[PDB]
Amino acid sequence: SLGPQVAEGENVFGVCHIFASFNDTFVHVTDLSGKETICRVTGGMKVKADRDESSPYAAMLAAQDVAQRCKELGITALHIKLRATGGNRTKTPGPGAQSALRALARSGMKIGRIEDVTPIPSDSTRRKGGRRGRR
RNA sequence: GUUCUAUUUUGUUGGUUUUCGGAACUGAGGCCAUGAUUAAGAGGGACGGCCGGGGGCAUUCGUAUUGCGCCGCUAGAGGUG
Numbered sequence: 222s223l224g225p226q227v228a229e230g231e232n233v234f235g236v237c238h239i240f241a242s243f244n245d246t247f248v249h250v251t252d253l254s255g256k257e258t259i260c261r262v263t264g265g266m267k268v269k270a271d272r273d274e275s276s277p278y279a280a281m282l283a284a285q286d287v288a289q290r291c292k293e294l295g296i297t298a299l300h301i302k303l304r305a306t307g308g309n310r311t312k313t314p315g316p317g318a319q320s321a322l323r324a325l326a327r328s329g330m331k332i333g334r335i336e337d338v339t340p341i342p343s344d345s346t347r348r349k350g351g352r353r354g355r356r
Numbered sequence: 357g358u359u360c361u362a363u364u365u366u367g368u369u370g371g372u373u374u375u376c377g378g379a380a381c382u383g384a385g386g387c388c389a390u391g392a393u394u395a396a397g398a399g400g401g402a403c404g405g406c407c408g409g410g411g412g413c414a415u416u417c418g419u420a421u422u423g424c425g426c427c428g429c430u431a432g433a434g435g436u437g
C-alpha cells in the first residue's frame with residue numbers, strides 16, 4: 222500500500238483482464254507479469270442473485286470496487302485485456318464488459334492499450350451439445 | 357524335269373521305249389499401275405508443359421481442451437427463463 226512513484230511525473234501501470242461470460246463478469250487487475258495480482262471482485266460478489274451476475278449493474282459495482290481498491294495502493298493506469306468465454310463456446314463478450322470498462326474509466330483509471338485475449342481456438346474439440354443442438 | 361496313266365497308232369498276235377493328253381510332285385522365268393481406302397469434333401496409347409482439400413506412407417506445426425506442479429489474492433465459482 223506504498224507507492225514509490227513520483228506523483229506528477231509518471232503513472233504506475235497495471236492490467237485488468239475483463240472476463241465477460243454470459244452468466245458472470247470477472248474484473249481482475251494484475252501487474253505487468255500477470256503472476257502477481259492486485260484486486261479481483263466479481264458480479265456475484267456485488268449482487269446476491271445468480272441471474273443478474275453478468276448484469277451491467279453488477280459489473281459496474283465490481284469495476285468501482287476494483288478501482289477503489291486499486292487507488293488504495295496507487296496504481297494509476299491500466300491496460301485492458303478483454304476476454305470472452307472462448308474455446309469451442311461463444312467468442313462474443315457479455316453485456317458486463319463495456320459497462321465495467323466504462324465504470325473504471327469514470328472512476329478514474331487511466332486507460333492504456335485495449336486488446337482481446339479471448340481464447341479463440343485454431344481448431345478445437347467437440348462442442349458441448351448434440352448433433353441437433355441446444356434446442 | 358520325276359512318278360502314274362484313257363489309249364488313237366506300227367495289216368492280225370507279244371515285250372520295251374518315245375510323240376501326244378489327264379492326275380501328283382517339282383525348278384528358272386514374263387506380267388499385274390502389282391497388292392495395305394481415309395484417319396471419325398469415335399476410341400486406346402506414346403509425348404510436352406501444367407493443374408488439382410484426388411489416393412497411400414512418413415514427418416512437422418498450430419491453438420484450444422482437460423489434468424498435474426509452483427506462485428499471487430480471494431468468498432464465491434459453474435449453470436439456467
Ligand SMILES: [Mg+2]
Pocket residue numbers: 351
Ligand atoms: Mg441432449
